[PDB]
Symmetry: D2
Subunit: 250 residues, 4 copies
């Protein structure tokens, strides 16, 4: 029987590439999404056309709230309902916007940025572990630039740092259960689709390896390594996939 | 005019030592507390007996909620109300208890551990900056963040977020002359509930003296960071751990 | 045409595992060795029996000296002489023994430990780059460098310098399409001189399975980094330690 | 009795500021130098004018060689010969120049950069420890930008990384002897006198805190803290003094 994976925020970009590569590797996938219903459903449809009943969709807001634990439990439950198992969890879903220190209220900013990047990964990790030849692991999507953060992105940065702490803490604690916990950390490496080419060029020019952004597929490559049998001794590790960007001084 | 400092969770232990050393250095202090009302007022009394009108208390729950921003705004406001200025913020208050992955609901555990260790520090930093000499913030971090205690994920996540805040705020507040730094104890004043046998186990692990840090030793690093001897230092976290984080399993 | 790889200290243990896995992936290999001539030739024989003319041996002392640069240039040269190209360099060869601060002279200890772990990797990196597809260098680092073994200062300094080389060379060789990465074991194949009781002590420290890594497991991470699956990865060091570095004292 | 300190490369700049501040604090000082004989003697004169018999000079090349262990032993011995004790060692002396991967031979480059920045610190640490209410410590001058290195400075960077490892290893090992081992890490924060003012300004403009370099005094301030009784529980710590420079992404 085929293993199953949950990928949060899997409708687009890096999450989509991860879900696709897991599927191509033989995984059945839960495609979690928030707002991108059309994209998520069309992805699941494409994957199911490839192999019957190997993809399902699951909608959840991962903003922090008192119902977030239940939402995360339900995401994991959806994998068990659909496929009878859950082997891999990929914490990809993420809010990303500036929150300067000096329309959204600050409590909403906190809830979205810390919720998506840190608390939901924690609760999903809890639910994943509680519900557990096999090769069980979690991959957290981190950020290679966390020590050299984007100006005015404190809450985002705090969230990604907490995600590092979660990766380490969970690796330590879940090791007895055979659950490995690792991370993949892109740099400022695949720029937002809205951004102008000229603004994208400012970042690209800074990347030592090829003066270009990573493809979503290149990020997904590191995720599939970490979930694979080639990484069976690897836990608590975060792989930078940044083309040398974090090595470049101001 | 004397400068003024806010120290969160200042009624006992390390927070108390920080507040005392700041006061001894000439600062007027806001002693924030949560449940330790008697201890907090006792300390304020002692400091005011030393120099009149140089200490006030301020009660606030630092658990995450939709009113945490208001509570943090009020803590900073209380410093301006009492002393007309706020020069130093010390983010000391912290919940610390295990939250295994496998009586408190998980929602509550998240709110207390992430709230106290990370979100409140953020909101206090915001309010501090907004309300603005030698201005700085010191965050009480943790030297063992990369070698965490078993089953302390939420606490560890909070302290990691605190590192990210220290860096992010240092970067962003530098143009305003506000320095943001951290002090990271390994083992200092051990928990009150911890038995002497378990305390001795931890003490035995420390290379420098086989003993825990005094609260005063931790405070010493805090007062260096706030002092004029640290005027070019921002985004730095000073370990004060007697070599504990250097010891392999 | 098949790509070619240089693996230093490849006659046994992790170096052999790396050479073997590269060969199985389709690489022609230079098996560098120092004292293990019989093991190195035996390995080359086995690989050549599998595919004709795909393995050669190369002997060199990688102790620091004024001729180390020439020795390292010759190792790289031997790859070009044998295979007409050099696509991958694996810096595996390493001296490892205690050097307490309080038979070998200290100058010899410095020369061997810093030479093998740091200076030779640097000189090999220089010669590799100057002689220049999917080109990359993999440095064998150490996951425990921030939690070092007691009285292993020179070894530890060498491994830290190897981190700096990994970073510096990644930055500088990126314009040439040469990626530079590392693999950091915690405990893998334990020293042959180590008694089984001491080996079991180390094994028990490992959260993931209470066991050391096989050489193959280390080699797996090396082959990932050299592969097309790692084409955007440079300046990264992958821990392969089963969580060892996460465990506090 | 006054405590005594060895400061390597103390004739100029940061080393000089350190020597001066230690002296002002009540230390007797050994002023080590390499080529700056006039500056070293002039400093010794100035300090002895202040308090008689509190400063001596010691010349040594700290380039790696088979005679380096003896040279380092003699530097420490000079403190004991002059002052009868040695309480503090400051590893400040440092070669700093580019060594591209693609007049000096590479073996000389290796000897100078790795010798001054790492091997000599190690040998001096050995001799210091062997020769031992007291407050013994070593302060190593590190570099805040070691993870974001200057282009083509690989040997320098390797040296500074090795200095980090020495700081940690020696802290662990010398703790039982009451010898603390710490570091102070400036950024690109006090620029080379040979650098043109226009290039200096490019670097100054990068520093978030004040858009300016650190004074040598400010670096010395951190050294003074670490040697003081206010740092009695601090060992294996490296204090960045970089005005936020290392926090700034490319
Ligand atoms: N792109 C980069 O260069 C880069 C750099 C560093 C780190 N990373 C990390 O890598 C991961 C993937 O990056 P990306 O750029 O592909 O991400 P992205 O497109 O910006 O967002 C990924 C998904 O997160 C989901 N999301 C946002 N808010 C949510 C919420 N409140 N509840 C549930 N889901 C929510 C969104 O789902 P819907 O579309 O369905 O609404 C979105 O599609 C992220 O964790 C990111 O932080 C990326
Ligand atoms: N002690 C150590 O060995 C050690 C080690 C590493 C890091 N640290 C860090 O150093 C700092 C001080 O340590 P410590 O041992 O002195 O701390 P602590 O005694 O455990 O706690 C300090 C104060 O935090 C306040 N606090 C707890 N929950 C709160 C809440 N929900 N809202 C508002 N305040 C709350 C408490 O105030 P009330 O009593 O008034 O209720 C308490 O007095 C902490 O940030 C800690 O994480 C300490
Ligand atoms: N084993 C572990 O648990 C572990 C843990 C952390 C890191 N690592 C790293 O992973 C790598 C492989 O480990 P390992 O245990 O397989 O290594 P190893 O057996 O201790 O040494 C590998 C080879 O290094 C060569 N070597 C030693 N001194 C040399 C010199 N002066 N000149 C030239 N070659 C010299 C030897 O070649 P000859 O036999 O031909 O003389 C030896 O076979 C090393 O870099 C190591 O530091 C290993
Ligand atoms: N300047 C900065 O912004 C900065 C940044 C990061 C780190 N640091 C670190 O801070 C420390 C002081 O910096 P700095 O700029 O003041 O240093 P510096 O002026 O470049 O050099 C300090 C001294 O090192 C000595 N030296 C050089 N080569 C030597 C050799 N082969 N043998 C013995 N001594 C030798 C020289 O002594 P003589 O003059 O007597 O010949 C020189 O005066 C250094 O360790 C440096 O790496 C500085
Ligand atoms: N560029 C960029 C992004 C970074 Br840095 N972190 C991110 N996180 C999310 N979720 N999306 C993004 O586009 C990015
Ligand atoms: N021992 C201990 C403590 C650590 Br580690 N982190 C802590 N945080 C708080 N707040 N209190 C404590 O006693 C401790
Ligand atoms: N055990 C072990 C070893 C470590 Br840790 N680093 C090493 N380096 C080499 N070269 N050999 C070894 O056996 C080990
Ligand atoms: N700017 C600058 C310098 C750095 Br970064 N590291 C250095 N090291 C030495 N020795 N001298 C210098 O001027 C500098």
């Amino acid at each position: 029987e085929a293993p199953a994976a949950v990928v949060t925020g899997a409708a687009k970009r890096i999450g989509r590439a991860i879900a696709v590569k897991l599927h191509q590797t033989g995984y059945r996938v839960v495609i979690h999404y928030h707002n991108s219903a059309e994209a998520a459903v069309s992805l699941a449809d494409e994957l199911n056309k490839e192999r019957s009943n190997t993809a399902v969709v699951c909608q959840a807001d991962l903003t922090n709230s008192n119902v977030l634990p239940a939402s995360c439990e339900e995401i994991i439950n959806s994998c068990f309902r659909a496929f009878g198992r859950c082997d891999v969890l990929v914490n990809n879903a993420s809010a990303f916007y500036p929150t300067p220190l000096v329309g959204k209220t600050v409590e909403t900013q906190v809830a979205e940025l810390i919720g998506t990047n840190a608390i939901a990964p924690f609760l999903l990790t809890m639910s994943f572990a509680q519900r557990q030849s096999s090769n069980l692991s979690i991959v957290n999507l981190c950020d290679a630039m966390v020590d050299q953060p984007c100006m005015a992105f404190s809450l985002y940065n705090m969230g990604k740092h907490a995600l590092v702490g979660l990766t380490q803490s969970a690796a330590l604690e879940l090791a007895p259960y055979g659950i490995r916990v690792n991370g993949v950390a892109p740099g400022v490496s695949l720029l937002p689709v809205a951004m102008g080419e000229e603004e994208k060029d400012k970042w690209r020019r800074k990347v030592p390896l090829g003066r270009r952004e990573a493809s979503a597929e290149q990020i997904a490559d590191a995720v599939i390594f970490l979930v694979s049998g080639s990484a069976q001794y690897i836990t608590g590790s975060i792989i930078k996939v940044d083309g040398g960007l974090s090595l470049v001084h101001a």
